[PDB]
Design an enzyme around this catalytic site. Structure first.
Site, mmCIF file in Angstrom:
data_model
loop_
_atom_site.group_PDB
_atom_site.id
_atom_site.type_symbol
_atom_site.label_atom_id
_atom_site.label_comp_id
_atom_site.label_asym_id
_atom_site.label_seq_id
_atom_site.Cartn_x
_atom_site.Cartn_y
_atom_site.Cartn_z
ATOM 1 N N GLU A 1 0.776 -1.186 -0.065
ATOM 2 C CA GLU A 1 0.026 -0.155 -0.021
ATOM 3 C C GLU A 1 0.931 1.171 -0.095
ATOM 4 O O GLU A 1 1.956 1.175 0.675
ATOM 5 C CB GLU A 1 -0.858 -0.015 1.316
ATOM 6 C CG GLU A 1 -2.245 0.906 1.054
ATOM 7 C CD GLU A 1 -3.057 0.438 0.131
ATOM 8 O OE1 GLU A 1 -3.311 -0.840 -0.048
ATOM 9 O OE2 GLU A 1 -3.694 0.920 -0.892
ATOM 10 N N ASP B 1 -10.738 4.062 -3.416
ATOM 11 C CA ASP B 1 -9.973 2.651 -3.309
ATOM 12 C C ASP B 1 -9.952 2.126 -4.535
ATOM 13 O O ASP B 1 -10.897 2.509 -5.750
ATOM 14 C CB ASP B 1 -10.693 1.845 -2.125
ATOM 15 C CG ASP B 1 -9.871 0.745 -1.629
ATOM 16 O OD1 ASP B 1 -8.603 0.702 -2.036
ATOM 17 O OD2 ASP B 1 -10.229 0.073 -0.751
#
Ligand SMILES: [Zn+2]
Ligand SMILES: [Zn+2]
Ligand SMILES: [Zn+2]
Ligand SMILES: [Zn+2]
Ligand SMILES: [Zn+2]
Ligand SMILES: [Zn+2]
Ligand SMILES: [Zn+2]
Ligand SMILES: [Zn+2]
Lengths: 441, 439
Positions: B16, B25
């Site tokens: 991430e 997202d």
């Protein structure tokens, strides 16, 4: 009226009478011994079977005195066991003094724990110190109608909190024989043994150099002579004056000091011809004076005896309290020693904690800087291993070399361990034997 | 052959990114920081409300680096809490190595404990150490089609039990800037700082100069020491950079004098009489030198990480020593108190003996006294019965001979009371100097 009485085993002996033969109550169950309930069926063979269950041998319906009293002790102890085991009459049982607990054990022994468990409201009034309501409520019961004498006596003992209601009866039964407990009014010839017990002429057992002249008292089994027993001259009326032995229809009225025998007129002129004499009034008053003096002294000695007896009971209570005192003070003293020792140990562990937290802090910081070194070294290594791509990277030498040259380290002070406590257990195994048990002296 | 990773939970930092601005997202949800899922609803104001609830300050939908990493540590600790709390995946958590455990924590961080608790068939394959089956069964999960990159990386790390799958990414990301994680193409102009990080020309800080802080490691360097990343022209295209002052003639010459790749105009001026070097002859030589240096650094780094492992072992050993000390002290104290309790029990046994003896004596004496009392009450009851005026005188002999029986209260010694007689002064002194604590 002057009353004298025992405590609680006696009371079961006074209420119920000892019969070594199987007997049926005029309206009750088959029982034997001293109030031992065998069975409730009418069949005699069932009663004999329960009898052999209690004795262990075939008796044929006859027991002995020692066996009857063993069964008595068993029955009373079992009744008190059934009292303390029962969960509805125990709380009211604990709050009573010895005498009323005493009466309750009697009631349970006569009717059973389940029989007395039915009398709820009289018990509810008795626990809370409401006596008279309980007495009158207890009077109305089948137990009162079957055996009213015993019921009235037990209710009176509940009322008063003293044994006098039985002491009076002890004095009343003083006019009854100690075997069949019938009233010694002169139909069966009363006899008074030197042990001051009274019996019937038929209740003396059986009664050649020697045929008799020796007889065991039926109640206390103290040996006396057959000649020393005199007829109980006390049960004569309810005339007073008795007639002479050899001189028929001629009353006695003189007391011979020579023979110490109460005598008749013709006797002290013929037989006791030259003996001493006293006119009956003066001699009777004299002897009454002497016997009153003896009874006063005996009462004083008996009072002092029971006072010393209760002092001894207090002394056994106090020795038991002394035992608890020593045992618990020893336990607490050793507990205090172990407490101060645990305190020292808890304070000691703190020092290990301090030193270890310091060393661990230093080594943790070292490990953090070492992780940073490892990471940025891996970065330099990847970027330098990136020389694989064929190119004119010469224009990048200065950065790739001078940074590849970055070689560094750290350092911390190597330390030693502290894992042994170093306790001298020999000293403590010797010191374990430092136990003193002084005395009052 | 370039496995260099050797870390533990930077893997989440590699998988991430880091984003100080709210972003949508891969699932379409509102997220921020390092993969922190705020909410699944489409409305932003709900996202800003949850953000200000999590951050604690007025943010206006923008965070900084240190607080975002605060949220990273917060979320990771909460993920491990949700791991140890769940009863379906904890037994499978214990049977794993540290690395496979890190992978499981990664999965929980991404999808939630209830999300990973759903893969029950595949989870049970992990605790039985059937790795290939677990890999193939996870490869066909919804999570694999949603985010196939992270799924492939985590599945490789589960199968192998090594960080190799991330080392590869660590080298791949070597072509991306450490800030916006974009591909360092000719556009987005790459720059290479002396700290050997690479960035874009725009990611070096916004509007005092000639001194600039590196965006990733914050090492101070000069705005002139930064060189454009000459290494990344693989795309498209022959490709030689031109001289510095001479904006038209390229550098094709290498001066042995200054060790500097130089141009011919610079040969006419500066390196007028210097010794020069051939192209291949110089490049191969410097490649040799740098290969030797990387060998030296790799060996030193291997021994370094060995020392790191050993130091962790030593900090474990000191805690084991602490436990040892405390438990040996406790056991010694318990042992002395044990022998002390034994001696106390023997002393109480002796006290019980003496007291039960005295009690037996007094009990039988009391029994004989009760006997006497009853026999006296009998004699008295029958004698006090003289009240009936009668010829009881014809009974004198019996009343007196038994009335005269007065006898035998038969005493014993009153035994002294037993006290304690301990010495707590001396014994608390000896209790207070028991400790050694030697080294
Ligand atoms: Zn009789
Ligand atoms: Zn007798
Ligand atoms: Zn005569
Ligand atoms: Zn005479
Ligand atoms: Zn960038
Ligand atoms: Zn840097
Ligand atoms: Zn030169
Ligand atoms: Zn030039």
């Amino acid at each position: 009226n002057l009353y004298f009485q025992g405590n609680i085993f006696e009371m079961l002996r006074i209420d119920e009478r000892l019969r070594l033969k199987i007997y049926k109550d005029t309206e009750g169950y088959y029982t034997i011994g001293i109030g031992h309930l065998l069975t409730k069926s009418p069949s005699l063979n069932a009663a004999k079977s329960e009898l052999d269950k209690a004795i262990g041998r075939n008796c044929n319906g006859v027991i002995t005195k020692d066996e009857a009293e063993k069964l008595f002790n068993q029955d009373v102890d079992a009744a008190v066991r059934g009292i303390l085991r029962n969960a509805k009459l125990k709380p009211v049982y604990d709050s009573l003094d010895a005498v009323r607990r005493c009466a309750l054990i009697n009631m349970v022994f006569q009717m059973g724990e389940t029989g007395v468990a039915g009398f709820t409201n009289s018990l509810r009034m008795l626990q809370q110190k409401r006596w008279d309501e309980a007495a009158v409520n207890l009077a109305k019961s089948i137990w009162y109608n079957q055996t009213p004498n015993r019921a009235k006596r037990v209710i009176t003992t509940f009322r008063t909190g003293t044994w006098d209601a039985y002491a009076a009866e002890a004095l009343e039964l003083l006019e009854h024989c100690g075997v069949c407990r019938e009233r010694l009014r002169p139909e069966r010839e009363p006899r008074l043994l030197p042990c001051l017990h009274s019996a019937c002429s038929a209740c003396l057992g059986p009664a050649a150099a020697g045929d008799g002249t020796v007889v065991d008292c039926p109640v206390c089994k103290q040996q006396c002579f057959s000649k020393d027993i005199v007829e109980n001259y006390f049960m004569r009326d309810s005339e007073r004056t008795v007639y002479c032995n050899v001189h028929k229809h001629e009353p006695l009225v003189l007391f011979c000091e020579s023979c110490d025998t109460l005598t008749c007129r013709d006797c002290q002129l013929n037989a006791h011809k030259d003996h001493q004499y006293q006119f009956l009034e003066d001699a009777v008053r004299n002897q009454r004076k002497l016997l009153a003096s003896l009874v006063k002294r005996l009462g004083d000695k008996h009072a002092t005896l029971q006072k010393s007896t209760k002092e001894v009971r207090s002394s056994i209570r106090q020795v038991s309290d002394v035992q608890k005192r020593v045992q618990v003070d020893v336990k607490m003293a050793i507990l205090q020693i172990m407490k101060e020792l645990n305190k020292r140990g808890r304070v000691l562990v703190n020092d290990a904690q301090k030193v270890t937290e310091g060393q661990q802090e230093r080594l943790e910081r070292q490990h953090w800087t070492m992780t940073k070194i490892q990471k940025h070294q891996e970065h330099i290594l990847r970027f330098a291993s990136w020389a694989l791509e064929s190119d004119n990277n010469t224009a990048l030498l200065l950065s790739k070399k001078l940074i590849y040259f970055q070689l560094h380290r750290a350092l911390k002070m190597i330390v030693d361990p502290v894992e042994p406590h170093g306790e001298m257990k020999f000293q403590w195994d010797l010191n374990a034997w430092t136990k003193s048990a002084e005395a009052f002296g």
